[PDB]
């Protein structure tokens, strides 16, 4: 239904936790005899105002999000409160790229890059920013089928800006983010290109973690925030992948462009990935 009854909704097992939310599999199951459907549940788990009133946007961005590369919404449910999801059994991009490694070549992690900047392009066409675009928020709808998840952070930018400005710090692994926003809480349909710029990294590392963005500062070497804003500042970044193919490593460098207005967009991006793919063959 668009309307799901709690009472009907059955707990399974946890899937995730965010900020003040978690995520869950629920059976619903209204005939009570294990045969209804999956489905990933979301709640928050603070009452407060702001959490409360952020939590209900992301509902209304969500449920007005239509395309093959973003985890579909299926409804919400109510106590007097819950968004309910559909349910993607191969779960995590970046476990699902550490466990089928030797199965991937890279036409496919092409492929899924194709199919998240696919995703990125419209969300900026629907004015809305991600602002935590990494390869844990990316769920596997198959093994030729990558969508965009968690919300909890987007944001839809007003008519009259391009860009928001965030009050408080950041509370994610510093290293997706774009120079602007770690200096000065400026978020964009820019600064998400940056981030995926890393999620191109974590393609072609295969989310790897030895060598992971976390793991490449530190090797590249006060502040953590103010060590790599100094770093990104001398133009040091992550290297070429092992045995990336050189155009790939390049497409990520111009996504690191150090203005925001440099980068290139997800609408010209896309074109070149789709003739990277096929490239390889
Ligand atoms: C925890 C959160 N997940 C969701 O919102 C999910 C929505 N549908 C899913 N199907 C499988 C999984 C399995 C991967 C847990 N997760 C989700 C996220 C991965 C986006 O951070």
Redesign the pocket.
């Given at each position: 239904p668009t309307i799901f009854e709690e009472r009907h909704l059955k707990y399974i097992s946890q899937?995730?936790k965010?900020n003040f939310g978690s995520?869950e599999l629920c059976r619903y199951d209204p005939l009570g005899d294990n045969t209804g459907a999956l489905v990933?549940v979301?709640q928050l788990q603070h009452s407060g105002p702001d959490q409360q009133r952020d939590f209900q946007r992301e509902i209304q961005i969500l449920k007005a999000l239509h395309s093959d590369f973003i985890?579909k919404y299926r409804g919400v449910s109510y106590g007097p409160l819950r968004l309910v999801?559909?349910?993607?059994?191969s779960?995590?991009l970046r476990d699902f790229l550490q466990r089928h490694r030797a199965r991937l070549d890279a036409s496919r992690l092409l492929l899924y890059s194709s199919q998240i900047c696919k995703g990125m392009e419209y969300l900026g066409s629907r004015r809305c920013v991600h602002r935590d675009l990494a390869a844990?928020?990316i769920?596997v709808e198959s093994e030729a089928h990558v969508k965009i998840?968690?919300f909890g952070l987007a944001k839809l930018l007003p008519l009259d800006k391009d860009y928001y400005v965030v009050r408080e710090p950041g509370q994610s692994p510093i290293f997706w983010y774009a120079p602007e926003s770690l200096s000065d809480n400026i978020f964009s349909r820019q600064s998400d290109v940056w981030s995926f710029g890393v999620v191109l990294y974590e393609l072609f590392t295969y989310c790897d973690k030895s060598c992971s963005p976390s793991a490449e500062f530190l090797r590249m070497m006060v502040p953590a925030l103010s060590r790599l804003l100094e770093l990104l500042e001398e133009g040091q970044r992550l290297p070429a992948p092992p045995a990336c193919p050189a155009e790939v490593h390049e497409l990520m460098k111009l996504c690191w462009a150090p203005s925001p207005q440099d980068r290139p967009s997800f609408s010209a991006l896309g074109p070149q990935l789709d003739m990277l793919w096929s490239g390889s063959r």
């Open positions: 899937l995730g965010g995520v990933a979301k985890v999801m559909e349910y993607l059994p779960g995590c844990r928020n769920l998840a968690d």
